């Protein structure tokens, strides 16, 4: 017999299996499609989730009841110090898919990126890339030959870049190394750009502009093993049910004499790889700017950091990106920021954002001050100040 009433299914079948990600660094499954006519430019950047804040902004949305009126919106801070270019990979179009042809590396690698290739760095002789560094001996013709091979045969050129994680407050010393696809220009142009950028820093302001829409690749928060009630949002069984109520009562019909793959079952929740799209860039801040949190209406000399620092992260002393809303991951997670895969002309995508004010009260409690000067002005002299 049929179900008494027709209700929608619990959960999405397009995010199965709900298993842990193979790596903690989210990987870009698909890059923006290459257009030769554009200039040579990067399509992605690596950052670290610092924390969330609040802004005030005047809305430009004709026909809305909040048009030209202040709205209060949640925002996410991504600490993004400039990345260092250390390598380049060539991809070839084959009848079996993309296949990596060659990887060319830079002469000098910093210690933070050479720690990426080790599980026990302190016990090692640190021999990685020493003979390869010797490959540059007084003519470096091996490197030029491989680069010419890439120019001759590669159809997709990607750069290898790593974060400068020593500039962040994280205690982790391993850098995060990723492939970032190069778009724009011919294959020769991409290869020349990659070679000429070896051992150089690339900033966020060269990849993302303000008011842009970008996508976020990250691994979500882990919750461990979870029951069906919270893992899948199933209905709780009555209070008086024997042997418990946080279950799915019927896990299958008599036939097929098996449990179906579509039935909600208890298991591991969170720590999934996710791609979240259409997050607007409200601010690309600079670490050298002493008015990160200042706007054109709030001229308080103020960094983006709240009072007492970001909870469980620290201070953002680098360039940063202020994104609208929420992005996947937890604090300190490595986050991949990717350019959008399509052209959005909606009023939400083309609106020019001008910020009024950014909240910098403490996130560690009911903070009520934006600045220590404001605090001591409100409370006056204390006993500890003498």
């Amino acid at each position: 017999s049929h179900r008494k009433y027709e209700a929608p299914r619990h959960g999405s079948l397009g995010f199965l299996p709900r298993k842990r990600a193979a790596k903690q660094r989210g990987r870009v499954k698909s890059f923006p499609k290459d257009v030769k006519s554009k200039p040579v430019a990067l399509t992605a950047f690596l950052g670290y989730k610092a924390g969330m804040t609040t802004i005030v902004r005047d809305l430009d949305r004709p026909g809305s009841k909040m048009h030209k009126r202040e709205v209060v919106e949640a925002a996410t801070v991504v600490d993004t110090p400039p990345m260092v270019v250390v390598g380049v990979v060539g991809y070839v179009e084959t009848p079996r898919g993309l296949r990596s042809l060659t990887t060319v590396w830079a002469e000098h690698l910093s210690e933070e990126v050479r720690r990426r290739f080790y599980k026990n760095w302190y016990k090692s002789k640190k021999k990685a890339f020493t003979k390869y560094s010797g490959k540059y001996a007084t003519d470096a013709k091996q490197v030029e030959t491989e680069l010419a091979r890439i120019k001759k045969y590669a159809s997709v050129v990607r750069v290898l870049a790593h974060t400068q994680i020593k500039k962040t407050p994280l205690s982790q010393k391993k850098a995060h190394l990723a492939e970032i696809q190069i778009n724009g220009g011919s294959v020769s142009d991409k290869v020349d750009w990659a070679k000429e950028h070896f051992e150089k820093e690339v900033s966020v302001d060269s990849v993302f502009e303000q008011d842009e829409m970008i996508d976020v690749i990250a691994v979500t928060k882990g919750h461990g093993f979870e029951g069906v009630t919270h893992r899948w949002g199933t209905k709780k069984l009555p209070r008086k049910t024997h042997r418990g109520l946080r279950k799915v009562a019927c896990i299958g019909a008599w036939h097929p004499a098996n449990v179906n793959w579509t039935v909600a079952r208890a298991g591991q929740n969170g720590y999934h790889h996710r791609t979240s799209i259409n997050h607007k860039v409200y601010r690309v801040g600079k670490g050298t700017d002493e008015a990160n949190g200042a706007t054109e209406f709030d001229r308080t000399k103020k960094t983006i950091n709240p009072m007492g620092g970001f909870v469980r992260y620290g201070n953002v002393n680098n360039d940063f990106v202020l994104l609208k809303g929420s992005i996947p991951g937890v604090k300190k997670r490595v986050v991949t920021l990717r350019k959008s895969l399509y052209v959005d002309t909606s009023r939400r995508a083309v609106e020019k954002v001008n910020l009024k004010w950014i909240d910098t009260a403490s996130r560690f409690g009911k903070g009520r001050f934006q600045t220590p000067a404001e605090k001591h002005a409100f409370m006056g002299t204390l006993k500890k100040d003498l």
């Binding site: 209406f297 009024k356 909240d359 009520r368 001050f369 404001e374 409100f378």
Partner: protein
């Protein structure tokens, strides 16, 4: 945008922070956090709350 002031303690209210209570007599009350709001719903005297 405007900085608001707590009705019970004088604490500075920034956009979004705290709750806003409209009594039956349409008097508008502003609370910067749940702490002062909870005291007010207990009909405490802010004049006698030692930190307001």
């Amino acid at each position: 945008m405007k900085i608001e002031v707590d009705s019970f303690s004088g604490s500075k209210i920034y956009p979004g922070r705290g709750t806003l209570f409209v009594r039956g007599d349409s008097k508008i009350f502003r609370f910067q956090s749940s702490k002062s709001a909870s005291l007010f719903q207990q009909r405490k005297n802010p004049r006698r709350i030692s930190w307001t």
